[PDB]
């Protein structure tokens, strides 16, 4: 009919949702977690510095073995790093150097990379020929590519600088599902531990939870004042943390449908570039435009510590599946491994 | 201590050596962002550079190896990707001078310049403003007064003054008058002059960067 009908019905729904949320907020996280003893100061040391890159690192991802990592830099190289030895396992010559995402497949067979060229290139680490070669050029996005994350050797979920997110089948090279409801650039993805759901942060300050198989947006979260530059699932899959350029992080719980706690400080005017959780979920680590990573008690919402050892923007922040170490990539070109 | 791991260290240092060699190669090449409204404007320069997302054109001129990054097809918010180019040597910015007559496009170009010339990532970064469609702008000036998009304009409706006024109405947008320099040029139909201008501007920007590396500037 008209927006003077359907936008009013949509507004009445948005009010019904906000009322339901305000009805479900019976306590904030602060007064309930006040029963939990504080984490104290988290001193941590740079156990390894990985010096092989030559330009700004944009993304890194830990392998499931908690030993290898992929890292992506606009010098046009992926490097696979043995975090125990500093050994460079592979260095992949990327066909379009303007890369700003990478992922390491949960099997360790494949790595993905992409950026201002819309392709999520899938690289087979374990050929018989012992070079690394492009298995697929996943071409059909139209924006720049901002995240790839493997669900399995045959499926990757990918986010774009256009409106969309897309699930791909590598074997065919075709989109099996396009996720559409994000109005802005979809900056970031994280898969839940079950890989049944993923959550997507966008520049429209919304987060959307997507059913991988149904295609439906199950929930929206909108408490951020500006771009959700980064997102990560809390390691049980029931909650997720959203880093924003508004200089805050917010914890959202899927069942609450609501913001539980905001992490902010007057000194922190820098935006947040990356977030990830320690395996317990107790520490939320956030990278900033300030040359620091802050360690937040995800329950108590205070600074447990600061990882100071950077001299440029922390671009990416992976925590191993074991919780053994925290990797902090930076525009320093250095990649520093912390625990 | 190591046994077979020593061969993985040998591989790691062979990789590091190849990485360093491609770092030399990548620093020896010179990186040019290409920006501007309209496809045909950028296309004209890309064509005149004599030897789908980001489109990258390589050309060698006078034994300098250029990479030119036509970002135009990216149709995505600059704020979330422009910081990739924090280290380009020059921003080639194209605007078709005809755009004043057309559906305000000149104001959109001036706003894009007021951004790119002031964006924090490009603070030290030169701009090469290619004014395109000189001939069509001359023809338009014989038809349409330039005050059609500039109420403040007060001068001769003849090519050289209208051009100079446009060039000023761009160069005065640059707040960072002393960090940046803007190497404005009028696109030559006669070829070999446009890529010669690009080569001279890149030369002078390399000179200024080396002066700052030397701490003389």
């Amino acid at each position: 009919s008209e927006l003077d009908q359907l936008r009013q019905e949509a507004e009445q729904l948005k009010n019904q949702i906000r009322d339901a949320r305000k009805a479900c907020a019976d306590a904030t996280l602060s007064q309930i977690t006040n029963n939990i003893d504080p984490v104290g100061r988290i001193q941590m040391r740079t156990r390894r510095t990985l010096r092989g890159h030559l330009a700004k690192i944009y993304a890194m991802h830990w392998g499931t073995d908690s030993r290898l990592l992929v890292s992506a830099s606009q010098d046009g190289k992926l490097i696979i790093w043995d975090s125990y030895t500093t050994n460079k396992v592979h260095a992949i010559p990327l066909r379009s150097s303007w890369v700003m995402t990478c992922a390491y497949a949960p099997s360790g067979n494949y790595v993905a990379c992409g950026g201002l060229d819309n392709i999520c290139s899938i690289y087979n680490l374990k050929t018989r020929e012992g070079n690394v070669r492009v298995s697929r050029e996943l071409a059909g996005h139209t924006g720049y590519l901002s995240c790839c994350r493997f669900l399995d050797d045959n499926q990757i979920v990918t986010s774009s600088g256009d409106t969309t997110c897309a699930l791909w089948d590598i074997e065919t090279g075709q989109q099996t599902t396009t996720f559409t409801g994000h109005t802005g650039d979809v900056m970031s993805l994280s898969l839940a531990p079950d890989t049944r759901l993923f959550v997507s942060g966008a520049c429209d300050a919304s987060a959307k939870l997507w059913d991988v198989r149904e295609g439906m947006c199950r929930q929206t979260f909108t408490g951020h004042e500006s771009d959700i530059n980064a997102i990560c699932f809390f390691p049980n899959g029931n909650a997720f943390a959203t880093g924003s350029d508004d200089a805050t992080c917010r914890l959202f719980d899927l069942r609450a449908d609501q913001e539980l706690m905001t992490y902010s400080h007057d000194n922190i005017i820098c935006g947040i570039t990356s977030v990830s959780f320690s395996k317990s979920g107790r520490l939320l680590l956030a990278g900033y435009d300030d040359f620091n990573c802050n360690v937040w008690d995800a329950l108590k919402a205070d600074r447990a510590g600061v990882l100071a050892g950077h001299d440029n923007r922390v671009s990416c922040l992976g925590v191993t599946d074991d919780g053994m170490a925290v990797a902090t990539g930076s525009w320093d070109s250095f990649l520093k491994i912390w625990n | 201590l190591s046994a077979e791991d020593k061969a993985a260290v040998e591989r790691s240092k062979m990789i590091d050596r190849n990485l360093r060699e491609d770092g030399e190669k990548a620093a020896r090449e010179v990186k040019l962002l290409l920006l501007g409204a309209g496809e045909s404007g950028k296309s004209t320069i890309v064509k005149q550079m004599k030897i789908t997302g980001i489109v990258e054109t390589h050309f060698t001129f006078k034994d300098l190896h250029f990479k030119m990054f036509d970002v135009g097809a990216q149709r995505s918010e600059r704020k979330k990707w422009i910081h990739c180019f924090e280290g380009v040597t020059a921003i080639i910015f194209c605007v078709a001078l005809s755009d004043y007559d057309l559906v305000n496009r000149m104001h959109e170009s001036m706003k894009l310049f007021d951004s790119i010339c002031n964006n924090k990532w490009f603070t030290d970064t030169s701009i090469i403003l290619f004014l395109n469609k000189k001939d069509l702008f001359e023809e338009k000036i014989k038809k349409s007064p330039l005050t059609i998009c500039y109420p403040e304009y007060a001068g001769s409706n003849t090519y050289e003054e209208a051009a100079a006024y446009i060039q000023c109405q761009f160069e005065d947008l640059n707040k960072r008058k002393d960090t940046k320099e803007i190497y404005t040029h009028f696109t030559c139909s006669t070829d070999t002059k446009n890529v010669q201008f690009v080569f001279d501007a890149v030369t002078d920007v390399i000179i200024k960067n080396n002066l700052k590396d030397c701490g003389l500037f």
Partner: single-chain antibody
Amino acid sequence: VQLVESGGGLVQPGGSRKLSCSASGFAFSSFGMHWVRQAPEKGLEWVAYISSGSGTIYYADTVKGRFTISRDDPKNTLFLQMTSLRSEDTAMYYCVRSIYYYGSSPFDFWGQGTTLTVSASADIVMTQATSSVPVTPGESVSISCRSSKSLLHSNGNTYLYWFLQRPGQSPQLLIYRMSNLASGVPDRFSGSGSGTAFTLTISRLEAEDVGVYYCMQHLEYPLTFGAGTKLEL
């Protein structure tokens, strides 16, 4: 992936000859290369190594200085030049590729070899406990070796390797670092050990499993092989 070797035949004793292998279908510059030799009835023994960068060359003490190993990466070809080659150097030689990184499978591909007929301590001893064992399809068999040193290095790898050589073909990698199977190996092979005593189990035994099984260590050069156990169907 192929490794085609040539430069063999009859030689007069104490002469010289240049053994060659052309690589095809793999990134030869990326790989280290080994030569392994099999005496006309004895077991495998290592000859030389040249790494990916053409550095860290090594030779066995039984050939050290007498042979020299070289490679031509721009020609994808490998060149074992043998000098002063003595009667005990008569063997079937094998070109063997290797690549070294976390989770790599070195010795994965062994070329078809070349016959060379010469006209007539301080190392790990692989005490392969038995020369032959009889087996039948569907049986189960335990093959064992002892190493004169614990292969469980400080990093927790056990540098034990197992190969099968089927009659009339070149050896093939079955298991690397005690408990990892090579690509294309049936999942019914399974290796285990303490770091110093080891077993290979061959469950659901198949007529394709027949041949000689060679253990090998990689904790220290020289890469001493065991004497091999023949499985007789």
